[PDB]
mmCIF file of C-alpha atoms (C1' of nucleotides) in Angstrom:
data_model
loop_
_atom_site.group_PDB
_atom_site.id
_atom_site.type_symbol
_atom_site.label_atom_id
_atom_site.label_comp_id
_atom_site.label_asym_id
_atom_site.label_seq_id
_atom_site.Cartn_x
_atom_site.Cartn_y
_atom_site.Cartn_z
ATOM 1 C CA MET A 1 78.320 79.754 111.049
ATOM 2 C CA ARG A 2 78.405 79.101 107.305
ATOM 3 C CA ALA A 3 75.035 79.259 105.562
ATOM 4 C CA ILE A 4 74.655 76.300 103.203
ATOM 5 C CA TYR A 5 73.128 78.647 100.642
ATOM 6 C CA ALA A 6 72.575 82.339 100.113
ATOM 7 C CA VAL A 7 71.180 84.006 97.008
ATOM 8 C CA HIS A 8 70.351 87.561 96.023
ATOM 9 C CA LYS A 9 68.346 88.181 92.869
ATOM 10 C CA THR A 10 67.936 91.189 90.582
ATOM 11 C CA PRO A 11 64.987 91.283 88.163
ATOM 12 C CA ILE A 12 66.001 92.234 84.627
ATOM 13 C CA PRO A 13 63.685 94.415 82.503
ATOM 14 C CA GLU A 14 62.707 93.573 78.958
ATOM 15 C CA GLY A 15 64.824 95.100 76.227
ATOM 16 C CA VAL A 16 67.965 94.554 78.322
ATOM 17 C CA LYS A 17 70.140 91.444 78.249
ATOM 18 C CA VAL A 18 72.626 90.597 80.995
ATOM 19 C CA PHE A 19 75.257 88.145 79.853
ATOM 20 C CA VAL A 20 77.456 86.675 82.553
ATOM 21 C CA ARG A 21 80.277 84.159 82.291
ATOM 22 C CA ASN A 22 83.383 83.658 84.428
ATOM 23 C CA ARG A 23 81.957 86.467 86.616
ATOM 24 C CA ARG A 24 82.449 89.017 83.820
ATOM 25 C CA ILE A 25 79.036 90.672 83.644
ATOM 26 C CA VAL A 26 78.201 92.313 80.315
ATOM 27 C CA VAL A 27 74.964 94.287 80.049
ATOM 28 C CA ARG A 28 73.399 95.476 76.805
ATOM 29 C CA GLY A 29 70.598 97.980 76.506
ATOM 30 C CA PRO A 30 69.102 100.817 74.482
ATOM 31 C CA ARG A 31 71.486 103.401 75.934
ATOM 32 C CA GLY A 32 74.537 101.279 75.214
ATOM 33 C CA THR A 33 76.650 98.505 76.677
ATOM 34 C CA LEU A 34 78.568 98.043 79.918
ATOM 35 C CA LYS A 35 81.017 95.506 81.288
ATOM 36 C CA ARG A 36 82.202 94.733 84.800
ATOM 37 C CA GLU A 37 84.687 92.022 85.770
ATOM 38 C CA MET A 38 83.569 91.176 89.300
ATOM 39 C CA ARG A 39 86.241 88.476 89.368
ATOM 40 C CA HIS A 40 87.705 89.585 92.705
ATOM 41 C CA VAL A 41 85.131 87.271 94.315
ATOM 42 C CA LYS A 42 84.223 83.610 93.899
ATOM 43 C CA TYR A 43 80.426 83.566 93.748
ATOM 44 C CA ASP A 44 78.032 82.147 91.173
ATOM 45 C CA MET A 45 76.510 85.118 89.280
ATOM 46 C CA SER A 46 74.169 83.483 86.792
ATOM 47 C CA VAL A 47 71.092 84.696 84.912
ATOM 48 C CA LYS A 48 68.241 82.257 85.305
ATOM 49 C CA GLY A 49 65.067 83.273 83.501
ATOM 50 C CA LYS A 50 63.230 82.687 80.246
ATOM 51 C CA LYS A 51 60.001 84.696 80.485
ATOM 52 C CA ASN A 52 61.052 87.067 83.286
ATOM 53 C CA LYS A 53 64.826 86.998 83.732
ATOM 54 C CA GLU A 54 66.787 87.539 86.924
ATOM 55 C CA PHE A 55 70.468 87.890 87.733
ATOM 56 C CA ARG A 56 71.033 85.694 90.780
ATOM 57 C CA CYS A 57 74.288 85.839 92.725
ATOM 58 C CA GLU A 58 74.769 82.849 95.005
ATOM 59 C CA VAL A 59 77.269 81.802 97.644
ATOM 60 C CA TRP A 60 77.543 78.259 99.013
ATOM 61 C CA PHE A 61 78.903 77.997 102.567
ATOM 62 C CA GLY A 62 79.740 81.669 102.927
ATOM 63 C CA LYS A 63 79.926 84.031 105.869
ATOM 64 C CA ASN A 64 77.999 87.225 106.527
ATOM 65 C CA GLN A 65 80.571 89.156 104.508
ATOM 66 C CA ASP A 66 79.650 86.885 101.606
ATOM 67 C CA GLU A 67 75.928 87.357 102.209
ATOM 68 C CA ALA A 68 76.668 91.104 102.050
ATOM 69 C CA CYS A 69 78.961 91.048 99.017
ATOM 70 C CA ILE A 70 76.310 89.083 97.130
ATOM 71 C CA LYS A 71 73.927 91.997 97.634
ATOM 72 C CA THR A 72 76.552 94.547 96.653
ATOM 73 C CA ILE A 73 77.299 92.655 93.421
ATOM 74 C CA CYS A 74 73.584 92.484 92.661
ATOM 75 C CA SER A 75 73.336 96.219 93.337
ATOM 76 C CA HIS A 76 76.196 96.917 90.942
ATOM 77 C CA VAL A 77 74.376 94.910 88.272
ATOM 78 C CA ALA A 78 71.155 96.803 89.002
ATOM 79 C CA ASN A 79 73.030 100.075 88.554
ATOM 80 C CA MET A 80 74.362 98.753 85.246
ATOM 81 C CA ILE A 81 70.752 98.037 84.252
ATOM 82 C CA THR A 82 69.831 101.593 85.201
ATOM 83 C CA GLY A 83 72.789 102.980 83.268
ATOM 84 C CA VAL A 84 71.784 101.100 80.123
ATOM 85 C CA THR A 85 68.030 101.796 80.420
ATOM 86 C CA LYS A 86 67.604 105.311 81.825
ATOM 87 C CA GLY A 87 71.197 106.524 82.234
ATOM 88 C CA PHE A 88 72.733 108.468 85.110
ATOM 89 C CA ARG A 89 72.986 112.244 85.307
ATOM 90 C CA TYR A 90 74.573 114.191 88.164
ATOM 91 C CA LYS A 91 73.830 117.915 88.326
ATOM 92 C CA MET A 92 76.512 120.008 90.032
ATOM 93 C CA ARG A 93 75.617 123.516 91.177
ATOM 94 C CA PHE A 94 78.320 126.149 91.650
ATOM 95 C CA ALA A 95 78.484 128.065 94.923
ATOM 96 C CA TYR A 96 80.508 131.250 95.268
ATOM 97 C CA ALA A 97 80.224 134.345 97.459
ATOM 98 C CA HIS A 98 82.369 136.880 95.585
ATOM 99 C CA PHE A 99 84.382 135.228 92.800
ATOM 100 C CA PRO A 100 82.386 133.754 89.887
ATOM 101 C CA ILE A 101 83.657 130.246 89.239
ATOM 102 C CA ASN A 102 84.075 130.236 85.458
ATOM 103 C CA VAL A 103 83.819 126.679 84.126
ATOM 104 C CA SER A 104 84.675 125.790 80.537
ATOM 105 C CA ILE A 105 84.520 122.405 78.823
ATOM 106 C CA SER A 106 87.575 122.061 76.607
ATOM 107 C CA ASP A 107 87.989 121.522 72.857
ATOM 108 C CA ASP A 108 87.022 117.852 73.021
ATOM 109 C CA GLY A 109 84.405 116.532 75.423
ATOM 110 C CA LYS A 110 87.037 115.922 78.103
ATOM 111 C CA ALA A 111 88.785 118.450 80.347
ATOM 112 C CA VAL A 112 86.406 120.535 82.400
ATOM 113 C CA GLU A 113 88.202 123.756 83.364
ATOM 114 C CA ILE A 114 87.688 125.815 86.516
ATOM 115 C CA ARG A 115 89.003 129.382 86.553
ATOM 116 C CA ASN A 116 88.713 132.142 89.149
ATOM 117 C CA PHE A 117 87.609 129.647 91.786
ATOM 118 C CA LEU A 118 88.241 131.832 94.834
ATOM 119 C CA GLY A 119 90.202 134.530 93.051
ATOM 120 C CA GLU A 120 93.100 132.104 92.658
ATOM 121 C CA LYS A 121 95.224 132.498 89.536
ATOM 122 C CA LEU A 122 95.604 128.724 89.362
ATOM 123 C CA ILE A 123 93.462 126.883 86.816
ATOM 124 C CA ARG A 124 91.892 123.544 87.741
ATOM 125 C CA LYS A 125 91.867 121.099 84.825
ATOM 126 C CA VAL A 126 89.760 117.975 85.383
ATOM 127 C CA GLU A 127 90.022 115.615 82.409
ATOM 128 C CA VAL A 128 86.850 113.534 82.538
ATOM 129 C CA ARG A 129 86.620 109.804 81.919
ATOM 130 C CA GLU A 130 85.683 108.515 78.489
ATOM 131 C CA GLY A 131 82.076 107.374 78.758
ATOM 132 C CA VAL A 132 80.666 110.423 80.521
ATOM 133 C CA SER A 133 79.618 113.694 78.897
ATOM 134 C CA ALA A 134 79.901 116.992 80.762
ATOM 135 C CA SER A 135 77.740 119.874 79.565
ATOM 136 C CA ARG A 136 77.336 123.376 80.984
ATOM 137 C CA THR A 137 73.647 124.233 81.315
ATOM 138 C CA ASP A 138 72.346 127.525 79.916
ATOM 139 C CA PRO A 139 71.511 130.170 82.559
ATOM 140 C CA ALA A 140 67.831 130.164 81.589
ATOM 141 C CA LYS A 141 67.363 126.637 82.937
ATOM 142 C CA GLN A 142 69.796 127.053 85.836
ATOM 143 C CA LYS A 143 72.812 129.343 85.930
ATOM 144 C CA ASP A 144 76.017 128.048 87.522
ATOM 145 C CA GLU A 145 75.157 124.453 86.645
ATOM 146 C CA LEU A 146 77.139 121.589 85.131
ATOM 147 C CA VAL A 147 75.646 118.197 84.321
ATOM 148 C CA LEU A 148 77.551 114.939 83.914
ATOM 149 C CA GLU A 149 75.582 112.214 82.150
ATOM 150 C CA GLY A 150 76.617 108.681 81.314
ATOM 151 C CA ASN A 151 75.865 104.980 81.442
ATOM 152 C CA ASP A 152 78.279 104.115 84.285
ATOM 153 C CA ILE A 153 77.300 105.440 87.706
ATOM 154 C CA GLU A 154 80.885 104.875 88.829
ATOM 155 C CA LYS A 155 82.373 106.970 86.021
ATOM 156 C CA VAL A 156 79.794 109.750 86.315
ATOM 157 C CA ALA A 157 79.937 110.019 90.103
ATOM 158 C CA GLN A 158 83.730 109.876 90.078
ATOM 159 C CA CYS A 159 83.862 112.737 87.578
ATOM 160 C CA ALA A 160 81.519 114.694 89.846
ATOM 161 C CA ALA A 161 83.757 113.921 92.824
ATOM 162 C CA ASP A 162 86.814 114.911 90.776
ATOM 163 C CA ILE A 163 85.344 118.341 90.025
ATOM 164 C CA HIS A 164 84.375 118.678 93.688
ATOM 165 C CA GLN A 165 87.839 117.768 94.982
ATOM 166 C CA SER A 166 89.436 120.081 92.422
ATOM 167 C CA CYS A 167 87.417 122.990 93.829
ATOM 168 C CA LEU A 168 88.235 122.644 97.523
ATOM 169 C CA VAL A 169 89.101 125.372 100.025
ATOM 170 C CA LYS A 170 92.440 125.463 101.838
ATOM 171 C CA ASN A 171 93.723 127.401 104.857
ATOM 172 C CA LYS A 172 90.321 128.928 105.668
ATOM 173 C CA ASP A 173 87.369 128.244 107.941
ATOM 174 C CA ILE A 174 85.205 126.081 105.679
ATOM 175 C CA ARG A 175 82.139 126.913 107.719
ATOM 176 C CA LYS A 176 82.635 130.284 106.096
ATOM 177 C CA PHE A 177 84.058 130.318 102.545
ATOM 178 C CA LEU A 178 81.408 127.848 101.419
ATOM 179 C CA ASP A 179 82.476 127.987 97.768
ATOM 180 C CA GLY A 180 82.773 124.952 95.541
ATOM 181 C CA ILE A 181 80.920 122.850 93.002
ATOM 182 C CA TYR A 182 78.439 120.599 94.792
ATOM 183 C CA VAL A 183 76.425 117.669 93.454
ATOM 184 C CA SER A 184 72.911 119.110 93.630
ATOM 185 C CA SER A 185 71.054 115.992 92.455
ATOM 186 C CA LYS A 186 71.676 112.418 91.312
ATOM 187 C CA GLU A 187 69.067 111.974 88.587
ATOM 188 C CA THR A 188 68.452 109.750 85.571
ATOM 189 C CA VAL A 189 68.490 110.768 81.914
ATOM 190 C CA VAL A 190 65.363 108.600 81.317
ATOM 191 C "C1'" G B 1 174.023 137.751 103.333
ATOM 192 C "C1'" G B 2 170.549 129.534 102.989
ATOM 193 C "C1'" U B 3 165.033 133.820 98.379
ATOM 194 C "C1'" G B 4 169.577 140.597 100.791
ATOM 195 C "C1'" U B 5 165.285 143.701 100.202
ATOM 196 C "C1'" A B 6 161.074 146.904 98.330
ATOM 197 C "C1'" G B 7 157.812 147.552 92.855
ATOM 198 C "C1'" U B 8 155.515 145.273 89.041
ATOM 199 C "C1'" G B 9 154.977 140.546 87.576
ATOM 200 C "C1'" A B 10 153.462 136.064 83.180
ATOM 201 C "C1'" A B 11 152.014 130.911 83.674
ATOM 202 C "C1'" G B 12 149.910 127.694 87.045
ATOM 203 C "C1'" C B 13 147.195 126.941 91.323
ATOM 204 C "C1'" U B 14 143.192 128.985 93.387
ATOM 205 C "C1'" A B 15 138.470 132.069 95.826
ATOM 206 C "C1'" C B 16 130.488 132.340 96.800
ATOM 207 C "C1'" C B 17 137.117 136.934 96.862
ATOM 208 C "C1'" A B 18 135.952 135.103 90.368
ATOM 209 C "C1'" A B 19 132.497 132.117 86.788
ATOM 210 C "C1'" G B 20 128.865 128.678 85.937
ATOM 211 C "C1'" U B 21 125.323 124.303 86.606
ATOM 212 C "C1'" G B 22 121.890 121.574 89.962
ATOM 213 C "C1'" A B 23 113.280 120.031 85.526
ATOM 214 C "C1'" C B 24 110.919 115.740 87.704
ATOM 215 C "C1'" G B 25 108.009 110.550 87.533
ATOM 216 C "C1'" G B 26 105.604 106.267 90.146
ATOM 217 C "C1'" A B 27 103.784 103.123 94.270
ATOM 218 C "C1'" U B 28 101.893 104.981 98.547
ATOM 219 C "C1'" A B 29 100.921 107.411 104.380
ATOM 220 C "C1'" C B 30 97.292 110.202 107.370
ATOM 221 C "C1'" U B 31 93.443 111.630 105.032
ATOM 222 C "C1'" G B 32 89.513 113.434 101.858
ATOM 223 C "C1'" A B 33 85.949 111.010 98.465
ATOM 224 C "C1'" C B 34 82.813 107.645 94.710
ATOM 225 C "C1'" U B 35 79.820 103.276 93.996
ATOM 226 C "C1'" G B 36 78.193 100.266 97.980
ATOM 227 C "C1'" G B 37 76.370 96.529 101.364
ATOM 228 C "C1'" A B 38 76.074 94.208 105.915
ATOM 229 C "C1'" C B 39 71.999 96.864 108.842
ATOM 230 C "C1'" G B 40 65.184 97.828 103.150
ATOM 231 C "C1'" C B 41 67.899 103.541 105.456
ATOM 232 C "C1'" A B 42 72.514 105.515 105.881
ATOM 233 C "C1'" U B 43 77.583 104.648 105.688
ATOM 234 C "C1'" C B 44 84.882 106.432 102.188
ATOM 235 C "C1'" U B 45 85.306 100.160 103.225
ATOM 236 C "C1'" U B 46 85.837 100.024 111.215
ATOM 237 C "C1'" A B 47 83.512 94.942 103.867
ATOM 238 C "C1'" A B 48 84.593 93.655 98.629
ATOM 239 C "C1'" G B 49 85.439 97.520 94.235
ATOM 240 C "C1'" C B 50 87.290 102.208 93.020
ATOM 241 C "C1'" C B 51 89.357 108.111 92.805
ATOM 242 C "C1'" U B 52 93.179 111.314 94.409
ATOM 243 C "C1'" G B 53 98.238 111.348 95.578
ATOM 244 C "C1'" A B 54 103.095 113.880 101.208
ATOM 245 C "C1'" A B 55 109.915 117.213 101.260
ATOM 246 C "C1'" U B 56 109.090 110.059 103.496
ATOM 247 C "C1'" C B 57 109.865 104.921 99.933
ATOM 248 C "C1'" C B 58 111.259 103.611 94.713
ATOM 249 C "C1'" G B 59 113.046 105.474 90.135
ATOM 250 C "C1'" A B 60 119.445 105.824 84.670
ATOM 251 C "C1'" G B 61 114.161 110.827 86.305
ATOM 252 C "C1'" A B 62 118.996 112.774 86.424
ATOM 253 C "C1'" C B 63 123.573 110.914 88.451
ATOM 254 C "C1'" C B 64 128.381 107.770 90.669
ATOM 255 C "C1'" A B 65 131.196 102.902 90.573
ATOM 256 C "C1'" G B 66 130.804 98.443 87.805
ATOM 257 C "C1'" G B 67 130.837 91.875 85.627
ATOM 258 C "C1'" C B 68 125.046 89.219 86.846
ATOM 259 C "C1'" C B 69 124.939 80.583 86.018
ATOM 260 C "C1'" U B 70 122.115 84.079 79.327
ATOM 261 C "C1'" A B 71 127.841 85.694 83.246
ATOM 262 C "C1'" C B 72 134.590 81.988 87.137
ATOM 263 C "C1'" A B 73 135.662 86.719 82.696
ATOM 264 C "C1'" G B 74 128.612 87.561 79.509
ATOM 265 C "C1'" C B 75 126.851 91.065 74.110
ATOM 266 C "C1'" A B 76 128.599 93.069 69.553
ATOM 267 C "C1'" U B 77 132.741 93.794 66.677
ATOM 268 C "C1'" G B 78 138.339 94.275 64.174
ATOM 269 C "C1'" C B 79 142.663 91.371 63.302
ATOM 270 C "C1'" C B 80 145.831 86.981 64.588
ATOM 271 C "C1'" U B 81 145.406 81.983 65.648
ATOM 272 C "C1'" G B 82 143.944 77.132 66.174
#
RNA sequence: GGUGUAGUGAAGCUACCAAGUGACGGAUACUGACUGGACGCAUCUUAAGCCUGAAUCCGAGACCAGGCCUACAGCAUGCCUG
């Protein structure tokens, strides 16, 4: 079965403009600008409003995988809208039983550093993507807390996952030894 | 007495019996994840899209031999010759 038509729409807020051409979606906004070349697919991806604008992704004679990938493209564009309007901010909380994980953002913005993870003398260097700021929160607000804020949910969440996978536990029962840096919340910078 | 026979014996050969020399990179596997639908949720993807990156594979990364219709004798170049 091939549906003659399927469309998924994403309402665009005011103050944000979503340009799209050749399936290269560019999104402007107060927090900045994003681009995404969703050219690995062959769908319509237009913006079709004057008063209240919407990004509509359409597929003509597609299959259920197309009716699903339309929604995932629309969701990516909605996350770009969020990243340019309110921004993304992932808060990672440190967890350690005996050895204080000492985290240090390097000279530039990049390169989070993890030392004394589980007593190990290794040092975990995680050089963050450009487009995402990592800042260590002061212990008054919340001790043992890093926050990664940006305009690209992909970049921010992948930096969070990179810090996570840098602080992993090997050769031990991971039901015990629960140490690591864990994403405590996926918030917005608003 | 086919080097008569003990001692030392240079040179050469030679010995983990002496002396030295032998960092790694990339694409990836099983995974483990991120964004994320289908399936209002959730889901690593048993879907697109992405992250990592195994002694295996690939690498002048180091190495060994060399002739490829740009080459049945190719590039540069010295001199002789047409």
